[PDB]
Design a protein around this ligand. Sequence first.
Ligand SMILES: O=C(O)CNC(=O)C(=O)O
Ligand SMILES: [Mg+2]
Ligand code: NI
Ligand SMILES: [Zn+2]
Length: 331
Amino acid sequence: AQNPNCNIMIFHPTKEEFNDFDKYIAYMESQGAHRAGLAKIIPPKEWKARETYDNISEILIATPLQQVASGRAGVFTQYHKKKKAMTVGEYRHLANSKKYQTPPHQNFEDLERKYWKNRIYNSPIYGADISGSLFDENTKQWNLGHLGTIQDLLEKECGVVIEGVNTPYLYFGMWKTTFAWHTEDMDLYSINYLHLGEPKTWYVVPPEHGQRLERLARELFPGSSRGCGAFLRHKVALISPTVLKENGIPFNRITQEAGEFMVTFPYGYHAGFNHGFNCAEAINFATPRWIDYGKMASQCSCGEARVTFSMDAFVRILQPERYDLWKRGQD
Ligand SMILES: O=C(O)CNC(=O)C(=O)O
Ligand SMILES: [Mg+2]
Ligand code: NI
Ligand SMILES: [Zn+2]
C-alpha cells in the first residue's frame, strides 16, 4: 500500500506531465497521495497563471465577512458578520493596516504559534467565495476555469444527464483569516491555487480517519452536535493542532506559498489560516474514484449549510433516499 503513514506529498510535474490534469491526479493517487487528504503541486518553472497581477484592485468584494470567534484558543467557533462592500484595493490596504497586519515573527512556526495563541482575540475580514477567475484564458495547463465539470464526470461514469454548473471562486485573505474544519460539498475534491501574497497554512486529517475527527468534534461542540448530525458542514468549528494531538487525532500540516497548488481529496477534512494579504482561487472537481464518496457523503438537513444550485442533482442521483429531507433543509 503506497503512503501508509498518510503523509502529505509534494509533487513537481514537468511541463509535459502538466498537460493532462486528470492523468496527473491519477498518477498522484498511484503514489498514495490521497491517503493524506491533501497534496501540494509545484508547477513546472515554465508555467505561469497569468502575466501580472498589476491590475486586480478593481475586483469587488461585495460581502466581506468579519470572522468573529467564540470559545477558547484551541476550540472555538466563528460566525461571519457581513460588512459593506469594498474593492480588492481597499481590502489590501485594510489588511496592511496596523489593526490587521501580520505581526513581526521569526518564521512560519512562530507565526503558527501566534495564530493559535491569539486568533480568538481578533476579528479579521475575509473576502470569500467570490465567483470568478484570475487565470489568463491563454493558460492552457491547470487553468481552474477550464477543468472538466463534475456534471460531465457523473454523466461519463453513470450515464445520467443533469443540470448544474461548476465555476471557480476567489478568496481574498488577511492575517488570521480562517477556514474551519470541513470536507467539500458531497465529499468532492478541491483544488486551490495561491495566486499572490502571503502564505496559507493547512491542517488535514487522512480520509481513512475522518470519523475520528467527527467524534472529537461532537465531544467538543456538544450543543452543535445535538442540533445537526453533520454540523461540520456548517463550516464554523476550529480545533487546534495541540488539541488534536491531546486527543490522538491523526493529522498533518503544510504551508502553501504563492504559485503553488493544493489538492484536497474526497473526505479529507481540512482547516487553516492565512498569514497576511493574499488571493487564492479554488474549485471543486470529481474523478471516477469520487463517486463512491459522493454516495456516502453526510449531509446537513438542519438548514444551516445552505449550498449551491448544483448540489441538488448530486443528492438527487447519488443519494435518492436522503433527497427529500436534504431538500427540506435547502427550503
Ligand atoms: O482557501 C480557503 O479559504 C479555503 N479553501 C478550501 O477549503 C479549499 O480550497 O478547499
Ligand atoms: Mg481590477
Ligand atoms: Ni475546502
Ligand atoms: Zn446542519
